[PDB]
Nucleic acid binder design. Structure first.
Length: 82
DNA sequence: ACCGGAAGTG
DNA sequence: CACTTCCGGT
């Protein structure tokens, strides 16, 4: 799953240059959109992956209450731990 | 950047 | 299903 993959990355320091926790409890910011996508596209063997396609995937999680967007902030989503 | 509909995949 | 692909919107 993607939200899995995100968390997989987010509990490893060796990717803080790419993606890390910021602001509130469950908030996280993608520092390098294009790189992340490349890695997810490596993992899913989909070479033609990019943030546009990944970001759509994320928005589908809004209805499913796993994620939502922190408005105003760039590349900043937040998990639904409630 | 960020959204969400729409059609396709295995 | 859980995305990927595409694209015309805000």
């Amino acid at each position: 799953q993607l939200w899995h993959f995100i968390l997989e990355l987010l509990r490893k320091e060796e990717y803080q240059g790419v993606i890390a926790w910021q602001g509130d409890y469950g908030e996280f910011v993608i520092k390098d959109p294009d790189e992340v996508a490349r890695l997810w596209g490596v993992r899913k063997c989909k070479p033609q992956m990019n943030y546009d396609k990944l970001s759509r995937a994320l928005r589908y999680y809004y209805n499913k209450r796993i994620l939502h967007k922190t408005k105003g902030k760039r590349f900043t989503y937040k998990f639904n731990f409630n």
